[PDB]
Amino acid sequence: LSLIAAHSHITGLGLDENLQPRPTSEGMVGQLQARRAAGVILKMVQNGTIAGRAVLVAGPPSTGKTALAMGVSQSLGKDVPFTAIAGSEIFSLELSKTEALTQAFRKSIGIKIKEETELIEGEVVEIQIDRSITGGHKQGKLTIKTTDMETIYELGNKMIDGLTKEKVLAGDVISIDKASGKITKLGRSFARSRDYDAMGADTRFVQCPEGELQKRKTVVHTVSLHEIDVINSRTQGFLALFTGDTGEIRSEVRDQINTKVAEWKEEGKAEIVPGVLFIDEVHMLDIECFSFINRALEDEFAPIVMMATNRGVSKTRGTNYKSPHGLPLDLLDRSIIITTKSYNEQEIKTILSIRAQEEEVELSSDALDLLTKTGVETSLRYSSNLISVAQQIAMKRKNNTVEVEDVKRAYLLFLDSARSVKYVQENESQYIDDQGNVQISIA
Amino acid sequence: SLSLIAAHSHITGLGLDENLQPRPTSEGMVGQLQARRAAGVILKMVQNGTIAGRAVLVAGPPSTGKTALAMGVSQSLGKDVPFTAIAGSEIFSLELSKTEALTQAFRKSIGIKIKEETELIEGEVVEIQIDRSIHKQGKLTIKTTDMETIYELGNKMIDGLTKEKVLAGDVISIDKASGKITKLGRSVQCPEGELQKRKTVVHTVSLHEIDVINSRTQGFLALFTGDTGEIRSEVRDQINTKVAEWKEEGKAEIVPGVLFIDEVHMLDIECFSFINRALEDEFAPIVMMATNRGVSKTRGTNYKSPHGLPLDLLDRSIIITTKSYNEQEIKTILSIRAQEEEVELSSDALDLLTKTGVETSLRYSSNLISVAQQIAMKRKNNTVEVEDVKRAYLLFLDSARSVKYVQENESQYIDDQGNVQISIAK
Amino acid sequence: VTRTAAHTHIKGLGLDESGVAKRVEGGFVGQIEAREACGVIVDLIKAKKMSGRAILLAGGPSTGKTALALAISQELGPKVPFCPLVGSELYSVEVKKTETLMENFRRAIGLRIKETKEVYEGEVTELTPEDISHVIVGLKSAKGTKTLRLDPTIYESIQREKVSIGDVIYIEANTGAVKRVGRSDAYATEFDLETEEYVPLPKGEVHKKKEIVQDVTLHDLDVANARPQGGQDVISMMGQLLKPKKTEITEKLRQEVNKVVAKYIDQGVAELIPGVLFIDEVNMLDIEIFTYLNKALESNIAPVVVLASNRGMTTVRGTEDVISPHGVPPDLIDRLLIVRTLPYDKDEIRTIIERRATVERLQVESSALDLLATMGTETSLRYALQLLAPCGILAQTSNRKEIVVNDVNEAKLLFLDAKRSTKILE
Amino acid sequence: TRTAAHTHIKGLGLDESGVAKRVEGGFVGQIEAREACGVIVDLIKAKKMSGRAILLAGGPSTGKTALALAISQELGPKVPFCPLVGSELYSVEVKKTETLMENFRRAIGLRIKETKEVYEGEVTELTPEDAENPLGGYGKTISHVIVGLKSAKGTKTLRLDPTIYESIQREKVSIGDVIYIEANTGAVKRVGRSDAYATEFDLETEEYVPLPKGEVHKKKEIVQDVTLHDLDVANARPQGGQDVISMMGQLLKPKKTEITEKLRQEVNKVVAKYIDQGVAELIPGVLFIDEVNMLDIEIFTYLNKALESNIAPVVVLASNRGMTTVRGTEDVISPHGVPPDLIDRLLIVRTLPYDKDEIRTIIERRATVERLQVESSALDLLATMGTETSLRYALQLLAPCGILAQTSNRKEIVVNDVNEAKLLFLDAKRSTKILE
Amino acid sequence: ITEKLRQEVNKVVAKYIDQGVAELIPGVLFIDEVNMLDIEIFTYLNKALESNIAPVVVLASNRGMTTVRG
Amino acid sequence: DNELIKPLQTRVLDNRKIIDTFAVLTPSAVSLDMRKLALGLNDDSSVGENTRLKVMQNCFEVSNPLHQLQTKLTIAFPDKSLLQYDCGKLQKLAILL
């Protein structure tokens, strides 16, 4: 379940075997130095040895830094946790800011435990269940077949109860798990003898299973560290895993959990898969948060943190002095900064073509040039938004291609920041100013 | 109450004579003659109990024994009398209003002694017959030092002894009224007289404790958990009127105590406004206040104040001022501190420590004594020599030397504007 | 194979028996005077005599304060409690900052006790109720058989655990916990297909008794005495799901816990292990936290708290006109001993880089290592430290093991420093 | 007995015609203020007007709290009097407006009388009977129960409903137990075992109680004073219910909640109905707000609105500052720290400072009530000290002088004792000078 | 509500949509007087507009050149 | 909606394996009398005897699905995997086999 989002066009970093960024691949365009740095960080993360490094992504708005993070996440792929949060999420009311940050960090450490399970899988030949009226004793036995073997089993009380709950019928194909005891109906073998109800709802036949009737299979349990913390924090913590409201979990629990996980790793019971945490608009964070971040990176079970910021020199929140990137020098000294540059014209034109391809919008060459010129003049995001509006205008025109006139109409109807600013400056009397004065009447 | 060695453990009293004239060095307290005199006058006023709602301020330079004086007063007052010492930063809570916290603090220092006479049998034990319905027939025998006699039980006593599963040949205490049964070890010990004794037990509680006890269905848990919540004012009024009635009846006596706020400079103007009225009412204890800052802006206000307190409170208080210690007083206080910490200093070492404490701070030398003792322990020496004190001085810094070090290299530290020179080069 | 962090190479202080510190031991380079002071402090802590002692590690950034703290923690050993903190952690939302601070204080004081565990483990043979009524259950073990009478709470646990006759059960007498360990092996062939898990009949006698040693803290006891924490009864479930948030533990509960611990020590069943509390970013603490920390340092039962700060002549948070040596008000400064930590020259930076490379399993050419050291001298040591991993990644991409100069230059061109970014912004 | 700051104040000290004697009821001076307080006390005793407000305005240590407590004493224990301070309004559980509303209603007392009939005594017989026909009822078919009670004046045989029998079974009552039955509600209470059967068993845990005095069936008329806030609390947090949910709620802390206006409306309706029948009467009391300067602007505005209610006590205010900015506002300088709109609703009772003679008389009275004897010369020294620095300083300095005199085993305080007390304890001006 | 619950709901919705029984309707979220939002809310909008599943947000403002709240 | 909407009870019931696998810690210190003293059900409580017994009976009859979490957090009983893990030599034998 997904829709075409602002970063839906990028499927990775698009790098070669020698970490040399391809000029355009996997959706990403240009930004070669930053993509190379991202690839180096990617290899460091995939190695899994370096812990608690902090990396900062800096540069002007719209220069793809959040796209760079999305590409990094796509390169990580599944089975490696990636927690993307914003600075605005940290300031909560039910948790201390350091508690919220701790919960965020522990969401970024993944534990994989592999287990081997014995599985029975069959076609049902017949099932029998002898239960005494006004009595609790029940007797049953099951016959279950495979293409190469058939066997009978005599059923215990719990197995009888489970099979009765599942309403197994002989024309079912089903698997039996000897440990869990759950029964899953895989499909149907033949028809229901044409009873006068449920006539043709079983047409989707399934093939008989083949091989040993009782076969061993492996199951992998992927769980984050934060989930384990919530599970072991209190008795009601499992409900809190979905409801929230976990409370401010005691630190001693965290210390014991860290020791236990360290023992599990050294024992080979569990495999730890650290991931990457991405913070958006970090400058929103408080100096108390950055103070906690300084120590939090030093921990051995910490992920690798990447921070997006663009405000340049600005007053750090909680203090009365400006700081080089909105962040204190305490955090700035311990972090490696990767930079992003403004885009050339050709990079913008190819980004626009890629976005139109992703949105399934067919742009004519002259229309593509006009849209690129508009994007170069004002902003890449503005032209990106204009693409879909032009497509809708073309559809309204009953044409299968987007022409230049559609783009012109979209420009005329919908404004950019500069045009709105100019129209405001010309007509300041029609809007409410900071001093609370405005003319509502026209005479 | 087993605990390690603190910085005030030596203070075993206020060191007063019969004529309230303090001796030069007694009960841990050196000098501070007028301060100790005033503290003793306050102590006698508290013991008399005829004066309520008096606030005393302790004044003069920081590190001049204001807390040491208050501790001396608390210890000289002894037990069986409340003495609450709370920091001003404990008042501000997210679950209790500041006014509610101050009210609880005032009431916690007023104690009420209520006598309960209970009939309890204390005896060494002899064999017990319990029988089924013939509701239940049972007999027990108790031995003491001079009697051995059979009691015939009833239904509830039989039920209680079955629940307790009391053995024989051991020692058991049973209360006739309450019905509680307390087990004791085998006879080291032995019953000492009559089987059934009439001894009263005295219970010491405060007004706050009574308020919490009547506050809820099971409010007595709040006396430990601390989640009392804002108690209704009618509940407190009921407690007040019932305590007045009990005192009139003569079945309970009131023991007024002392409330100590160690850091009054943290309460805001609202707290002072409430405190002004809390002193006036009856059942108000005596409040001891300590402040070190001369003239500052009161928290919650935008103007300075003569002691950090509004003049309305200053009109209601009497101020005790402390002189700074001289070199001789410093020397003898360091001698007492070293004796308490089990450190054998030399004479020249003691003189050097005295001069060091006079130059920088008494606390600094007091903390340096243990460091010097540990340094000497590394050299396998019993007596602390001069070189140990010099090494302790060199390795651990005082405030002024650290300030000088920071001042001369302010570039490598973070300044108020957030600038720092991390680069060792250039 | 293994993961690496900021302080993976820090194994100890490397101090000899006499206390003097070699130039290079325990992974430390230089800072000999601070190491000697820290060793003296370690001796002071190990004495287990004083309480509430506080010291301040004052120095610039990237100078070795956290490294010293972690080295002290390692050298003391896992037996003692060492609790690192940032001041930001104290600013809780559920309870006041005082409650969090006091909880951290008592969490840093350790208690080691001896406890006897009574264990029963059996397969079940009869289930009879004494009629909520006591239950009668028979149990066998490889050495023999026994029948037990269990309290109604245990009966509820067994009923809610879906125990059948012929199930194997584990009962811990101290807690009254019933765990179904599985189905007996003797019934393995009872069916062909059931969800049963078969376990073998327990070895030995039904009743076993063993003596363990378990480590607890004062905070753990406080939590135990404050709220229900375990149990398999619905009563326990309701008791623990009620009042879920933290509460302001009262001074009375702490006093009672102290009295209990003193009784345990006097009986010899418990021993005390005073530990260390470390607070970092102390400048984050507001004036209220410092004001209460003044009170806690005078407490008779407190750990050896160490403070790290790296700001000079900065205003105290909360206050508007208090200029202090390190953001610490003069009241707390007099309670502290300041340990100065000094910056690093070029040779020590080079040695540190070499050791870090050796620890992280990297191979560095002498010229490349010289270039990295001189560029760290130019900008910052930590900059060189974090560049090591990208350099190692770059070397692997070239199918080359040892790091060469080209990788270092490429890494510098790819990743920039804070000063370079600030220049770019300008 | 303990001696508070306002212990010596025994009354307003007024004549039948309203004139106040120069020295009566512990008061010294303040003739005009005392007369105004007498008029206000008459207005309160009239019990006709609602929402009237007056303000006791004067400097620190002038007698605002003294006048408030004198008014409380003069009104008597049958008139509500809720003391308060301005800082207590800032709650953390509910808005300050709700706390002001709650306290404001506390000062409207209601006196409700109820006649109750109770059956009490020692049980002698208990013979449950079934219905005359088995078809008469369902299941057990238990009919009335007959109980025999014994009192100091005789015995009576009662016929009880099966519900009362169920209550008896619940309370676990046996023969000889002293019981207590309320015909008003059908509630049975088990007082205990009779002292007659105290020595039946030589070891038994039973609360033996004496045989009830008077008749077995005594009818008494009960009169109690209950506040409107009490009814509001009873409706908001009822104590009824014996379910597990009820017990779990009982264990919860009684946090204040914003009681809706609808509940007050219903309470007002029911109280009006019962007063209409004549059973109960309404007694508007007095609400005292000390240090009105500390209130926020929102609290002042809600005070403005509260005075427009139909039921409202006479709020008396104290302020010791003038031309002071109102808390919660940046620019509004106001006469007494009270917003100008609220001042327009107030009546200011000006209180004037004292001279040397009044201070001398006050010191005399304070020393008398303190069980301390003071010499005339030492008393003149104390009066000069008080007029030099402050009266309250001397009034508090009486006690250390007495303690010092006792330490010298002297019956009366001597001038040397006053000098030594001066040396031991300083004042605000002297402390400020010594700190400079 | 934790991200786990939201992801589980999204997963089950995706499963049942793939089964063909359900259809997705985006909808419109109109936030009148967008001036009233704080800067933190604006930054979360900045992140939330990039969410893979989000509606079309219509904002209205009657203000001119004024300082952004927060 | 019976599958689209799954309450907290069925989520606790269905995820048995994760709860069994990951509940490891146990309380450091407990006091058994607090379990009954907190609810006021002790023999010497202010709650009436009949009401106390009624509450006890209702608690006995009521059903809780969170029992498994209680019993897992009460005692840290090791499972059949430890015999693979307690001995390193058995671990090596397992991999080699």
Ligand SMILES: Nc1ncnc2c1ncn2[C@@H]1O[C@H](COP(=O)(O)OP(=O)(O)O)[C@@H](O)[C@H]1O
């Ligand atoms: N180098 C790039 N290659 C492909 N798409 C890009 C690139 N840079 C930016 N974009 C796209 O342009 C839009 C704006 O980039 P964004 O990441 O929002 O910039 P910023 O992170 O500075 O806000 C997004 O849709 C993003 O995917």
Ligand SMILES: Nc1ncnc2c1ncn2[C@@H]1O[C@H](COP(=O)(O)OP(=O)(O)O)[C@@H](O)[C@H]1O
């Ligand atoms: N007169 C005295 N005799 C002995 N020790 C003293 C005396 N005055 C102060 N001290 C000790 O010196 C230290 C500082 O006293 P303290 O009461 O903390 O100062 P202040 O309250 O002014 O900050 C404490 O260790 C205290 O025990």
Ligand SMILES: Nc1ncnc2c1ncn2[C@@H]1O[C@H](COP(=O)(O)OP(=O)(O)O)[C@@H](O)[C@H]1O
């Ligand atoms: N003397 C040293 N020897 C070896 N490594 C060091 C030394 N000082 C610092 N480091 C390394 O550099 C890092 C910075 O030290 P740190 O203690 O964080 O400085 P500070 O706490 O003063 O800011 C440490 O985490 C450690 O990995």
Ligand SMILES: Nc1ncnc2c1ncn2[C@@H]1O[C@H](COP(=O)(O)OP(=O)(O)O)[C@@H](O)[C@H]1O
């Ligand atoms: N008219 C009076 N006659 C006798 N004593 C008085 C009189 N007025 C005030 N006092 C005494 O002096 C004190 C000052 O009055 P008080 O109300 O406390 O002043 P404030 O205005 O500060 O509240 C009172 O507590 C009382 O003990």
Ligand SMILES: [Mg+2]
């Ligand atoms: Mg972006």
Ligand SMILES: [Mg+2]
């Ligand atoms: Mg002091």
Ligand SMILES: [Mg+2]
């Ligand atoms: Mg550091």
Ligand SMILES: [Mg+2]
């Ligand atoms: Mg006054």
